[PDB]
Amino acid sequence: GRVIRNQRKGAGSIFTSHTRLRQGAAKLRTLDYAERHGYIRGIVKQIVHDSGRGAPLAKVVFRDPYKYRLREEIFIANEGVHTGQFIYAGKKASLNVGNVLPLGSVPEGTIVSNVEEKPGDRGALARASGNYVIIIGHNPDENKTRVRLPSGAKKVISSDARGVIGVIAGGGRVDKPLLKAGRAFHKYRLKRNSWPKTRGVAMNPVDHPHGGGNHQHIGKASTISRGAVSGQKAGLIAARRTGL
Amino acid sequence: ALKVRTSATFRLPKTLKLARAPKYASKAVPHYNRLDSYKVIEQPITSETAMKKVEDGNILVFQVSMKANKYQIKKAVKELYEVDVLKVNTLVRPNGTKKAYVRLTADYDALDIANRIGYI
Amino acid sequence: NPLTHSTPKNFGIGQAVQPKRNLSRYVKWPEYVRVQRQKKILSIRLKVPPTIAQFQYTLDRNTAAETFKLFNKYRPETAAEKKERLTASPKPYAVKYGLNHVVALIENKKAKLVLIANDVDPIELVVFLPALCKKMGVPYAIVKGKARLGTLVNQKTSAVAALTEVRAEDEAALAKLVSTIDANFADKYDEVKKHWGGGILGNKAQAKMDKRAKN
Amino acid sequence: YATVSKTHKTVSRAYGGSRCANCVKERIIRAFLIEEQKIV
RNA sequence: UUGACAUUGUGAAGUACUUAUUCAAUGAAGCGGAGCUGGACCACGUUCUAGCAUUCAAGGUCCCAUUCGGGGCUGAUCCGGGUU
RNA sequence: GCUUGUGACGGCCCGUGAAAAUCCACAGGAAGGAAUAGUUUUCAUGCCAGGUCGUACUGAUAACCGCAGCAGGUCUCCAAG
RNA sequence: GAUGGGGAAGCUCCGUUUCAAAGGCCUGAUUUUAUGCAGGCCACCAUCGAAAGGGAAUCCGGUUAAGAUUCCGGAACCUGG
Ligand SMILES: [Cl-]
Ligand SMILES: [Mg+2]
Ligand SMILES: [Mg+2]
Ligand SMILES: [Mg+2]
Ligand SMILES: [Mg+2]
Ligand SMILES: [Mg+2]
Ligand SMILES: [Mg+2]
Ligand SMILES: [Mg+2]
Ligand SMILES: [Mg+2]
Ligand SMILES: [Mg+2]
Ligand SMILES: [Mg+2]
């Protein structure tokens, strides 16, 4: 047979991300002296739309501690943040929506977003619209913090990791049906070339493991083991169970 | 004690650079002028259309080298024919040669220059 | 006084721009600088075998100056005075140098005092000399500076220096230096052979270990 | 703008050709009131 | 994918260390230890406001040899050069 | 009225619809500066110079591609009663 | 798509600011001659990529067998100095 569709995507020729209209990578500030010892105040300049991203972005301007100029930061805006609002980031920041604090300096049950997996990676968790992280424990002796992830998983993170108080804005987006193929087309026009999708059983055997036959059917179990090789992993990979 | 470094970035130090003092010449015989006046102005153009511009337009038409620009054409005409030049327009002919329209100042008559050169 | 005023600046967090401070501790040095500094650290962090560790002991400043004072009186003839002699001569007295030359003198029991440099980068060249001198009964001293040894032999570096014969008016000085030098190197060779060097911790690790032991 | 005179490109006031009059007014009021609050 | 050997060292008892190796960030800026000041082991200049913050810093003090200015310390505590 | 330009508005998106060269303004106050004298070439007038390469014509039921002076194919502006 | 580097027996492959000591414009100091020497500034770090994107500045009348917003007459404008 020939190389199947999911194998061709790794070459990255026509399957790259469409990033012309992106506002920029959304990240927190670089962990510096002011962040780890006190706090620094920033000002929200505007809240703007970002192509390919459901959640809006906030432009926050900080002053440079070591030379006379302004520095621009691109944050993911939480619900309630407005233009002209002061943002406080650091170890001694207050517990208010939009402030950036270490996970070890907030009480139990705090709701946070854009959480760092490690101190200084500038935000990895709870970035999509309407998602958040719940802090459910502290380990002061081990300097660890237990959190709950949007998928439901429980993770142990360093207490020096940072996060933003609040929930990511733009929630409830996926509750509205697209209602036609045209709106699906424009959604992925600004993300990547992954739409529309052709079913494997509609193809020929040379094209897909599901292809061929005088009837349209799979012909073997669609549950594929974790140890299978490229060209075989089509269907339900390493499924623990199936059915409704 | 040590030097006080207000910056954390280290840069390549500035060191003395010496000019070249070769022990033998590069070619030892300089080449003569590759574009003199006789190589810039090749020959006048004596077509009937060109002759009309001489008597009427006070314009001299020449064939010039492909390597010459308008500065060199103006300089060559002034010393070859002892005339003042108002402006020069040039073009590349379809046969691969360059033709220059040279207009003299009001103090000069192109027809008197043409018959002195030898073409009428 | 009526025109000048005092306006102190606030250099706290979130306040005025920080002033220019010395950042030599944080300088991103060139690669070659870091390698030569980290090489020094690595050879101290690891355990050092006794054969190499014996070279960390060097003659102290006091008798080393007396040692070089005696050796400076037997400088080899320079090229300038070489011409005068060539253009019938007394027997010369001079310092012997050259690794192959000096080793042969030691094996023939002709060297009376041997100076050994402690900073030979291919350390294998000189590492066997303390044992060879000890086996042959020739007193030796590990001295600091291969450049300094080269100075008295009109070379950039020498890596070794030895005296085989001395003038009768300097035998008393030589004998006194041998007694002092033997007490520092030859007499203590037996126990230094059983001591491992290195194992030193870094500044931050040392304080961390002390804190853990304290509490 | 490089060919015209400066009188066509500015206004005889602070922040003349950068900020409008109302925004300049807000800057001055905010600057005075905040600094007074700092003393107290 | 699993085991063995090499890379591959250091200490204890029935896991511990650091230097190899690995990951990450920063135009390698504030790390580690101590010492002041305060409070009860912690802190030690910034939170009504869409303003403003840059000229080795003003001031204090010590030098030049007075001229239009220049040079130290302090302001801004020491120690170790392990960027974190 | 037709064509076209433009202004203030309104509808639509889980679509909100380039970048850089380049030019200007402001904040700032380092220096430079007058009385028997100086400064502005962002006011007016006056002086000099502006190189190199392309430029004809067809643009199609005959000048392009289809073996050809082939009923095929080949992007666009102007538009009378 | 070079350089710094890392791959590959090798033709060459990766990568484009990357584990690099990566570069030059305001003038001061000198009246030996042309730029050595003194504070500071800036760290952006090749290059290629549009005759429909961005972009300093021209119009009318006349003129040829065949040229023109390009020549002639008249009237303007921009840039650099
Ligand atoms: Cl496919
Ligand atoms: Mg079919
Ligand atoms: Mg198949
Ligand atoms: Mg199968
Ligand atoms: Mg031309
Ligand atoms: Mg034409
Ligand atoms: Mg053809
Ligand atoms: Mg053909
Ligand atoms: Mg390449
Ligand atoms: Mg180009
Ligand atoms: Mg024509």
mmCIF file with all atom_site columns, C-alpha atoms (C1' of nucleotides) and ligand atoms in Angstrom, chain B residues 70 90-91, chain F residues 53-55, chain G residues 70, ligand 5:
data_model
loop_
_atom_site.group_PDB
_atom_site.id
_atom_site.type_symbol
_atom_site.label_atom_id
_atom_site.label_alt_id
_atom_site.label_comp_id
_atom_site.label_asym_id
_atom_site.label_entity_id
_atom_site.label_seq_id
_atom_site.pdbx_PDB_ins_code
_atom_site.Cartn_x
_atom_site.Cartn_y
_atom_site.Cartn_z
_atom_site.occupancy
_atom_site.B_iso_or_equiv
_atom_site.pdbx_formal_charge
_atom_site.auth_seq_id
_atom_site.auth_comp_id
_atom_site.auth_asym_id
_atom_site.auth_atom_id
_atom_site.pdbx_PDB_model_num
ATOM   1 C  CA    . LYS B 1 70 ? 25.884 60.105 -19.363 1.00 0.00 ? 70 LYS B CA    1
ATOM   2 C  CA    . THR B 1 90 ? 20.750 57.676 -24.365 1.00 0.00 ? 90 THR B CA    1
ATOM   3 C  CA    . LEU B 1 91 ? 19.214 54.401 -25.509 1.00 0.00 ? 91 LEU B CA    1
ATOM   4 C  "C1'" . C   F 2 53 ? 18.550 48.909 -17.228 1.00 0.00 ? 53 C   F "C1'" 1
ATOM   5 C  "C1'" . G   F 2 54 ? 13.401 48.400 -19.713 1.00 0.00 ? 54 G   F "C1'" 1
ATOM   6 C  "C1'" . U   F 2 55 ? 10.472 51.705 -23.484 1.00 0.00 ? 55 U   F "C1'" 1
ATOM   7 C  "C1'" . U   G 3 70 ? 10.714 60.065 -22.366 1.00 0.00 ? 70 U   G "C1'" 1
HETATM 8 MG MG    . MG  H 4 .  ? 16.348 55.296 -21.066 1.00 0.00 ? 5  MG  H MG    1
#
